[PDB]
Structure formats: C-alpha cells, structure tokens
C-alpha cells in the first residue's frame, strides 16, 4: 500500500469531518427551526394574509443578485428567441426570411446558445436583425396560443436597450421576471425571537396522495376560508355551495392518519361585508336549525361549533379559532402564543409528567 | 356527435378481437413450462456494510455503471456521493429547496441530476476544475411535480411529470423537443430499456403504455390492473416487462405475446409495493413492502426463495449493481444497508 493514497484516504477522512461539520450546523439550524404549514381555499384570503405579512424589499440591492438576473434575463432572452424560431419551424406554412444570410445567423445563434459565458454584441445583433421582420410579430400572433412567455417582445426591445455595457435596470424588470405562479413559495421572517418558515400550496392538484404524505413532519397547520362562501359563487353547475367541499377539505385533513396528533389553526377573513349581507340576506341556505335565531352576533358561533365538532373523537389536538383584525400585529400574537403553547404541550408529554 | 359512440362500438369490436387473440395465445399452460425446471433452494444474505450521516428520510437512490459510487438523496436538502468499497464520502451538495423526490446518475459518470416539487430539475457537473459542484442549468416548463427522471444519453434526458405528460429534454438548448400525451392519470414512475430505444410509462389509471423515442407513437397498451402502479423494471434483454401495484400484487407482461403471464401474491401479503428490481440472471425478483419485509421471489416457480428483514421503518428504495454482486436498499430509518 502506497503512503500517498493512504494520506489521500485520511485526507478524505478529515474532509469528511468537514462535511460532518456542515451536517452538524445544518442539522442544528434545521432542528431549532419552527415549521408551520399553510393551506387555504380562497385566493383572496391567502393573498391578503401573505401580502399583509410582506415587508418591502428592494429588487436591486445587491450586485450579486444583479449578476443573477443578468443570467435569468439572458436565459429568457435566448430561450425566447429560440422558442420563436422553433415555433416558426413547427408551422406547416413555409415561412422563411427574405434575407438568406439571416438563416445562417439563426443557425449560428442555435450554435451560440450552448456556451456558458457572457453575451456578446454579435448575438444581440442577430436577434435584433431577425426581430426587425414584422412577420416575426405575426408569428407572435400565431404563437400567442402556444407555449410562450407573453412578455417576450418587451424582453427583445429591452435587450435593444441592454446592448450597451454597464447597465443597471430598475425593479419592474426583476419583479416582472418573477411573475410566475407554480412551485411552492417559502417565506422566512422573524417575530419575537422565533424564526418561522411557511409552506403554501399552489393549488396545483385537487387530489392529494404523495405530496400530501410527504408533509408529515410539521408542528402546526393553518387553514383559512371565507365564511361568506355560502353567498359566493364557485360553481360550474347549479350547486354553488363552496362550504361543502371546504368541509370536505377540513374533514379530509382531520381524518387523514398521518396528521392524527397535529393541531389545526383556523381563520375567517371577511366579516364586515358579511355583516351587511347578514342584514341583506338570511342564512337559510345551509340549515334551518342553524338559522333558528335572527340575531347577527351569534351567527359566527354556529360556524365555529360546526368546524370545531367536525373532529373525529380525538382530544389530543384542538382547533384554535380567531377573527379578522385591522392590524397584522394582533394576528402574529395568536400564532405566537399558539405555537408556544403547543411546544409547551409537546415538552410536557416528552418529560412524562403529563 | 353520435359518431363517437359509433366508433366506440367499432373500438369494442377491436376489443373483442383482442380478447379472441389473447385467448388464442392463452391456449397454452405456463405451469408445465415452470414445472419442467429444478428449484433453487433457500438463500441467506447478510448485511456487510451500513451507512450513516443522514438526519432525515431517504427518498432516492441510483447506481453508477462503474459499480463503485452510490448516490443517495435526503429531504433535509443535501446530496452526498458514496464510496461503497471503503465507506468514504466523495462530495456533499446543498440545493435550493429541500423537496427531493428523485435522483439519477450519469452512465458516463460526469453528471448528477435531481428534482422535486419545485418544478425545476437541476443538472450538476462533477468534473469541474475549481473543486466544487456548480449548478449548470435549471430546466422548467412543467406544471406539476416530477416523480422520476433518468438519463438515456449525455445529450438528451427524459422526465415524467405531474401534468400527466412525458417530455424529452435537450441540455444544451434547455428546451424540450418531443412531448408525449394520452394519459388521463398521473404518471407515477419510469423505466427505459437497456437498448435505450423504448421506455414505458406507468400511471395511476391502472394502465401502462409503451413509448418510442424517435417516432413518438404509443404502440401497445397494457391494461388489466385493479390499482395504482408504483415501480417498473426491465428484463436485461428487453423482451419482458414487469409491473408493481398497490394491492401487494405484481404482474409480468410481454410485448410480443401481448398478454399477462403470471401474477404474484400470497394470502399473508397485504402491504403494497414500493420498489421493484431484477437481477442480471432474471431468475430472481426483489420487492419492497410496507410491513418492513422484502420478499425474494422466484420468477419462474412463483415461490419465495427467502425472506430478508432487519429494517425498523418502511423501505423506500431498492436496486442492484450493474455487475451483480450486491443489492442496495434504503428506508425511512435514515440508514442504508447493503445485502451481499
């Protein structure tokens, strides 16, 4: 056995100890972190709460992030123009350019797409000279119904401005570049010594098996609905009762075996407009026995007694109820002492005393 | 508008043509053929190496063609590359999001690619001169999650996704070339032939489709399952197709016979299938269960040649090395155990 590769082995042991240090710091910072899941029915409620908690950032604060969106804007530029030419090639009409040399420029730019370097003036000249044909805009009209990012022409005229070096563009290019929906958006913020991580759902599926089983490890669940949904139209048929499938969601989560010992937090976003329609319209649609009493104040109480007693004979967990508040500062208090209390419960059950 | 029903009657006529043809190929008894061979006997395997270091579950595992390096993906947000001969780490890779449902490794050994719920598959270069691991590309364009994705060649890769479609990708242009449609249910798994010309796609519609790469046309449909399909594995010559299912049953199909051959189950086996893998010989069948027990099946004689156990939590991943000397397993127990 050679000494030098043996020293490479022990060197792999100490570099493996460095890897173990990364696993230690990552595992401790994961293990101290407070995780909470976000669900909801209405888009306006979830968007109202998450934009309500949103603290304003600057898009261009860092030059490293500036390099990031240089790569992303270059990606949308080159990806856009190659999508335009292959979109033309997918047409059954014979649509070629008048100038034949521009086709050599187009094959050269299909070669030029692969390099990892920076953008040169010649490729920008190719895409601008090809872009000056109005039939490419006619192909934007045809390809409007196909797979394409709809802001694309702005990227090319913008790149006509971007051709000069040492540019810095403003915020709306960055924010417009992150105008997309799919994927789960993670948020990280701090309130009173606790670090929160929220995981929403893009609403990508009606059916939940695999990704719903992978959300097993979680401290608490936030479920938001609009109680006003009995007067709200969510229907493709005569039956417009959103609360039926909403209670199907709540019962579906509560009756799932994976989430047997985890609590639920529950919010009601809209109340004022709700009160005015209480005067305008009686809640007779759901149940008559629900609408035993005319008076507006206790009309909420039935909703929390229904959603509260939809639990299936389990008393290790309890559904916390809350109401809409003018200021976000009151909202995070309920989350704060709620998760503090359930952590205290978990530690008490861990110590064996309770 | 009633013509769709008319062609549904003609379609049903082609279906009774299918049952008559499959009866004509169902004249013969397989039990005689399986009866004409000698049994193998009891097999005992022992765990020679175990692996550590993960603080979370194991959702992916994939082999290299050199039969040295193993890659394992956890959901705490890290990839680590293993050496199986000496139990040494090679590289440790952090990624943007902790959601990882699949992994892969290059046949050439140069690339590694992962992905998950964030709709973005990332391919990583390992032989870069700077001494780290860099994000080369981020491929996007799907609307759902991607369940499994694997390299056929170094220039073009295949993914399966949650929008019920499949897609062929090109790395250098970062744009999809060919897309495959025709499923009504979610695509759950993927496997490709060793000849690399044909890959089959399982789904949750209790069906399986045989897809071609160059021509883009589904040629044969295999149906007759009662539940979802989780794992797929190919026979080494490419002439036999095996399927896993949810109800603790497994079936084998043939492309040239166009009929199911043998269904594997037992009265005491009620837990579903999580992974399926063959051996080089094709005589043996490995399968993972939900009740912590991996039964080793005889493919021809349909009897259990042995039972292996020793994990505490549910097994997720199963595979064999290319040279045939070892079987690796992974579980939710956060430890890996290899059988020899």
């Amino acid at each position, epitope marked *: 056995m050679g000494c030098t590769l043996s020293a490479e082995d022990k060197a792999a042991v100490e570099r493996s100890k460095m890897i173990d240090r990364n696993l230690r710091e990552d595992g401790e910072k994961a293990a101290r972190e407070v995780k909470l899941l976000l669900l909801g029915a209405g888009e306006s409620g979830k968007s109202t709460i998450v934009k309500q908690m949103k603290i304003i950032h600057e898009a261009g604060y860092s030059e490293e992030e500036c390099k990031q969106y240089k790569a992303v804007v270059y990606s949308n530029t080159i990806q856009s123009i190659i999508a335009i030419i*292959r979109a033309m*090639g*997918r047409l059954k009409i014979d649509f070629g350019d008048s100038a*034949r*040399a521009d*086709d*050599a420029r187009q*094959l050269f730019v*299909l*070669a*030029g797409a*692969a*390099e990892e*370097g920076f953008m040169t003036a010649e490729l920008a000249g190719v895409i601008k000279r090809l872009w000056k044909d109005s039939g490419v805009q006619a192909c934007f009209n045809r390809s409007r119904e196909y797979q394409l990012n709809d802001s694309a022409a702005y990227y090319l005229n913008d790149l006509d401005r971007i051709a000069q070096p040492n540019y810095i563009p403003t915020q709306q290019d960055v924010l417009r570049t992150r105008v997309k929906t799919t994927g789960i958006v993670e948020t990280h913020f701090t309130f009173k010594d606790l670090h929160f991580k929220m995981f929403d759902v893009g609403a990508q599926r009606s059916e939940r098996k695999k990704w719903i089983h992978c959300f097993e490890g979680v401290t608490a669940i936030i479920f938001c609905v609009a109680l006003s949904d009995y007067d709200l139209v969510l229907a493709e048929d005569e039956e417009m009762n959103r609360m039926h499938e909403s209670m199907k969601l709540f019962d579906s989560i509560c009756n799932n075996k994976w989430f047997t010992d985890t609590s639920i937090i529950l919010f009601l976003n809209k109340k004022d407009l709700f009160e005015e329609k209480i005067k305008k319209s009686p809640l007779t649609i759901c149940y008559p026995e629900y609408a035993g009493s005319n008076t507006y104040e206790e009309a909420a109480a039935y909703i929390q007694c229904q959603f509260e007693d939809l639990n299936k004979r389990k008393d290790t967990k309890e559904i916390y109820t809350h109401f809409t508040c003018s200021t976000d500062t009151k909202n995070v208090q309920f989350v704060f002492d709620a998760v503090t209390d359930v952590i205290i419960k978990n530690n008490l059950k861990d110590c064996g005393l309770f | 508008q009633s013509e769709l029903d008319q062609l549904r009657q003609e379609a049903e006529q082609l279906k009774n043509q299918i049952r008559d043809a499959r009866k004509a190929c169902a004249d013969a008894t397989l039990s005689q053929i399986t009866n004409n061979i000698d049994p193998v006997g009891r097999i005992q395997m022992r765990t020679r190496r175990t692996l550590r270091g993960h603080l979370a579950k194991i959702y992916a595992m994939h082999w290299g063609t050199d039969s040295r390096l193993l890659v394992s993906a956890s959901q705490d947000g890290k990839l680590i590359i293993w050496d199986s001969y000496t139990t040494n780490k090679v590289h440790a890779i952090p990624l943007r999001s902790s959601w990882v449902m699949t992994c892969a490794y290059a046949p*050439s050994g*140069n690339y590694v690619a992962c992905g998950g719920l964030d709709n973005i598959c990332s391919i990583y270069n390992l*032989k870069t001169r700077e001494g780290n691991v860099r994000v080369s590309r981020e491929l996007a364009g799907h609307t759902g999650y991607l369940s499994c994705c694997r390299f056929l*060649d*170094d*220039n*073009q890769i295949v993914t399966s996704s949650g929008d019920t479609t499949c897609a062929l990708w*090109d790395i*250098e*242009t970062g744009q999809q*070339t*060919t897309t495959f449609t025709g499923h009504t249910g979610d695509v759950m798994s993927l496997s490709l032939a060793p000849d690399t010309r044909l890959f089959v796609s399982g789904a949750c519609d209790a069906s399986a489709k045989l897809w071609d790469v160059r021509e883009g046309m589904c040629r044969q449909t295999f149906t007759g399952h009662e539940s979802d399909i989780n794992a797929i594995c190919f026979f080494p010559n490419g002439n036999a197709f095996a399927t896993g299912s949810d109800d603790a049953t497994c079936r084998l199909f043939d492309l040239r016979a166009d009929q199911e051959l043998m269904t594997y189950s037992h009265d005491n086996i009620i837990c579903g299938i999580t992974s399926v893998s063959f051996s080089k010989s094709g005589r043996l069948l490995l399968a993972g269960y939900d009740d912590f027990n991996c039964n080793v099946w005889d493919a021809l004689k349909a009897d259990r040649a042995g039972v292996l156990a020793g994990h505490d939590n549910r097994v997720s991943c199963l595979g064999v090395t290319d040279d045939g000397m070892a079987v690796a397993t992974g579980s939710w127990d956060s430890f890996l155990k290899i059988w020899n």
Partner: antibody
Amino acid sequence: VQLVESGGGLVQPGGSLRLSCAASGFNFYYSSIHWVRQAPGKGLEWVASIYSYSGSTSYADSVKGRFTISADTSKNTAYLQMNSLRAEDTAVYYCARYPWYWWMEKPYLSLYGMDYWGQGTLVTVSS
Amino acid sequence: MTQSPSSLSASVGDRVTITCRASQSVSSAVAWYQQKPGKAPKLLIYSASSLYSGVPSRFSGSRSGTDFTLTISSLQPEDFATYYCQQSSSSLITFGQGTKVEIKR
C-alpha cells in the same frame, strides 16, 4: 440512400473537367453536399461545398478565386467545376452530405456530422 | 486555427484514450470518423457524446472545455484504423491530422 460520383478522370495540367455527385432518394433542397481532398500519404482536407437553401457557399482559402460551383435542385444532381489546376492538386474526391437544418423537414434531434459518404474516385494532375 | 491530436498503440482488450484539443472556444459540434484503407469514412459519434445507430457499447466519449476524450474499452481484433477529429462550428470546416492504432507483438 446512395451518393454516386461522376465526371472524374485523369487530367493534364491546363485542362478542366466537371465534377458531379448524384442525389438518390433524399431531399436535396434541405441538405448540403461537401467535397474533400484526400492527398496520397496524408489526411483529409476540405475545399468546397454547395448550400441549396440560402445559395451562398464557402471555399477553402488556398482554392478560392479559381473554382466556381453550381447546382440544379430539380434534377437531384450537384456539379463542381474545377479550373486552373496545379500539379499539387492530385487527390481523391469524396461526396459527403451534411444536414444544416434538421427542424424544417420534421421535428428531429440536433445533429453535427456527415451522414452519407460516397465511394470516391481518383483525379490526378500529371504531364 | 488548428488542433493537436495524439497517437498511441495497445494490445487486445486495452483501453485507449485519444485526445483532440482545440485552440479557441468551440461549442459541442465534434464528430469522430473511422478510416481504414479501402473504405469510406464511417460516422461513430455526433455532437461529441451521442452514439450513432448500430455502433456497439464499446465506444464512449466526453466533453470537458475544449478537451475531448475518446474511450474504447473491450477491444476487438478487427478494429485498427485511423480516427479523425472533426470541427463543425463555423462555415469554415477543419479536419484533424489523424491518429493510428497498432497491435502490440
């Protein structure tokens, strides 16, 4: 498909002959035809090419200013006219086919290589 | 611009590595041809990685920067000929100087 050369022969200095390669069964409008020089004892040099879809063509630097080329896409026959031959121009000429654009025919994977090769023939310059 | 290949000889079943290094930055437009005397050039690999249809699993390849490496494992007795490195990234087309493979006696 088959690529068949024609028009070759053994040549004297000061003469001129017309080189030709026949296209068989493939679309000639969508491809390019390439001619290379195989020197005796040495490797391969590339000299001339015919591009059908754009019309412009490229020549080797040592040879440009002497040769001219034309082609007829309707008869599936491409021609090369060689003039001002010198004694060093003895070489074997291969007919070769490279596809520049692969998408306008049908949707196919990107390619970079010579698909089909002719059998070649000897042309010499000797007094 | 030009490129500088290399040449080596080996025995039966020996791995051989052929390296074709470029002068400037070139995209993945590279092909390898086999030329034995009495035969036309045969295309083996296109775009420097992907194999042609009909070629067995013995051949491989890679791309790193402008360095390209050809790998032939499990060598056959019939495979002895020149191998050419090809560039196709600009309208100008450059061919290589070529290698050779001989059997060790």
